[PDB]
Design a protein around this ligand. Sequence first.
Ligand SMILES: *[C@@H]1C[C@@H](O)[C@@H](O)[C@@H](CO)O1
Ligand SMILES: [Ca+2]
Length: 837
Amino acid sequence: AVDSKQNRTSDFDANWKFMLSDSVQAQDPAFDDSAWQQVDLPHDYSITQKYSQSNEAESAYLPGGTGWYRKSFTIDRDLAGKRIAINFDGVYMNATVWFNGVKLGTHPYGYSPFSFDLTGNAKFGGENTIVVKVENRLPSSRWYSGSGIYRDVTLTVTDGVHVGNNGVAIKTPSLATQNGGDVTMNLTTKVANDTEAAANITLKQTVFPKGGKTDAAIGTVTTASKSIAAGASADVTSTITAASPKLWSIKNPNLYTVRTEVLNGGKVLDTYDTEYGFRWTGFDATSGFSLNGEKVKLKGVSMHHDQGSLGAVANRRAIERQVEILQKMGVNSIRTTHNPAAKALIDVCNEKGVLVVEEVFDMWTEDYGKWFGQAIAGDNAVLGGDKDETWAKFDLTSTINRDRNAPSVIMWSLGNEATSAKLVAWTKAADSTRPMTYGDNKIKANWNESNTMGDNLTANGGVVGTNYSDGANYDKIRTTHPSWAIYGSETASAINSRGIYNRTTGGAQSSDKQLTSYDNSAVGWGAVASSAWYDVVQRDFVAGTYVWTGFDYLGEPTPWNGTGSGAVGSWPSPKNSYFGIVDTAGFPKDTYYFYQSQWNDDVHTLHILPAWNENVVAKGSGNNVPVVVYTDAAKVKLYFTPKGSTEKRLIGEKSFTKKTTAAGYTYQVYEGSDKDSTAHKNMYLTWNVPWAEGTISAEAYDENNRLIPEGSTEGNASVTTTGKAAKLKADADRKTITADGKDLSYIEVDVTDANGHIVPDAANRVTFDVKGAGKLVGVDNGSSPDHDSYQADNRKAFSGKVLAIVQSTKEAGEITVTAKADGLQSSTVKIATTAVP
Ligand SMILES: *[C@@H]1C[C@@H](O)[C@@H](O)[C@@H](CO)O1
Ligand SMILES: [Ca+2]
């Protein structure tokens, strides 16, 4: 049902048919697909298949396969003469596209956007059929990719004379000094003349605050007449003087719409909008990163693309929720390891104020490595980037073309350890406004290839990323290469489960397929969170850090990882990662509050581990339990209240010492008499407390030695011995969502005792009854070795918590979700859905 009522670019996600099959040939329009599954995109056809130990642990034991997507739709007569194109923000992988039986082309890479023109084969005034074949033979990748059309699909309908796809490039080369007054904008606009007659057009271009009207423009320009031959294109340059634009920054992500109208005489033929933000960055070899002339430490996380129980589906609300949970931790930057992000993530970070280091590739047997250095066939009409060299150039320029105007994107990352020099040149030619980079692992060993490749980055205005360097290695790079601007492109790789306290050690396979929540567990080549941050926060020349990872992701379940088929350990084997600060369900681990005490200067943190039940704590020498406090306060007083008492007694008091760097960054370290012999562990506080039923509570004091109001800080300011499990506590993060068939509500359910305290080891199976104008689309507990179906109506809680994800329908109404558990009191939440205006 495509006609003239839809916008220039319109949502094309609804009403597809899907079939998983390696034998069908379903490209012909007359193919009978009446027995196929009916799905709304985005869609992941790996996440619904069963785990199998004949698959690979690194990709979560889930299969791939060959998936077919079909959509039959109408093109109304009122679109005769118009240009029509279908745009894929991502298809994993090896896509083949037919339109009305005619093959249009292929796209190997599973992570980059691409499009196809439909005009040449369209049946105007009749039925049309688009077919997409997806092939994921599952040697695959080092992490869970998912399979299928896992990102949004859109249709673009334009006049014959129109702005090209991603056709507007914006530069503000003097912003750093023009800031506050008139800012010069240099724009380049690609205008295509897909008619059979010569076109003579002008452009009217306007810059106005996002969501506003054109009468609020801070700058406009009309260009002189440009002649464009029939079937040709032209690059129209123009200059706008923007009157005192609001800068885009982390705290104030002010956004603008740059509207381009293609006029013929006094008639608008095409109107193209692009999102923009005014900001400039800088990387200094001595003092690190700056945003809008102000020094900023890159407090970053590496993030894979999948969304937990939803698989690879790039749902906008799922992505938005991730960024919001990271922001509460104090994260200000995301590295899209190791592939282009969904456009949805770029939109979210533009709106939320998060700096994005957008990575384009991982490395440089049937995977993308075969296609990286191959040319694009002459009869492959795929569109998106340059087609004159290799697929790598196409996918790189396609990503840059999509995101070149996004203010959140500060850097282009080219990979993660001849070809390097080619990628760097392609990036600089494609977008000169941002530095390029990559994460190099062999800089530690100081290979001659790393010295050369690092100098080549700097010579082209790039920034050097070093993977898993410690403080000594940071200093060696700084001394050996005084001209390099460096940062920790991949750090920490601590491995932890959520809610595990009966031991404080880890870093290797255990006996319960879980790992300690204490920050004493990391892979051999990595470091614990306190060690990786201590080395960065001391050094102004280390611009920042990108912790591996922010969220747990499917696949790579190190220390239970495995290349090749076969279970690692006893089945069911761990199938998602342990690197994340937050688990796949969005539930933070304990180290989340360490980072928050280090990074979030808008909140106060006071967090105690472990949970204070005898069957979950670790008893060391003298039956003492190691108690850890994460906090940003200057001083902490620790108390203990015996079970059945209302009076607390002081059991310790420790003050932080504040350190300041030359650039002005401040951090805290404990230098008391009983400090830890490992310096980085003194970024938090530790007490050895004898076990006894009761409550351990903490009070926070500021630099003036005065109390911080309790309850106003984040984290568990106290831990108490709980009773047995008695009731469930459900809570929806959003109690009203949009009835568009896309919006989600996340319902965390906690297992609590009769007094509401979370039972720290509770694993009761919780059943979800979803009624009304919504559907259950996922259940999750973040537990790596749990193989229960994400699409079931039930799941065991893990460490006292379980998650339910409900999706709206396209009819406004109410959703009722009841969480049930044998012997426990149920909990019910109600979510309203509101129609789209
Ligand atoms: C850095 C590269 C990333 O893909 C992960 O494999 C990580 C594991 O520690 O190291
Ligand atoms: Ca703080």
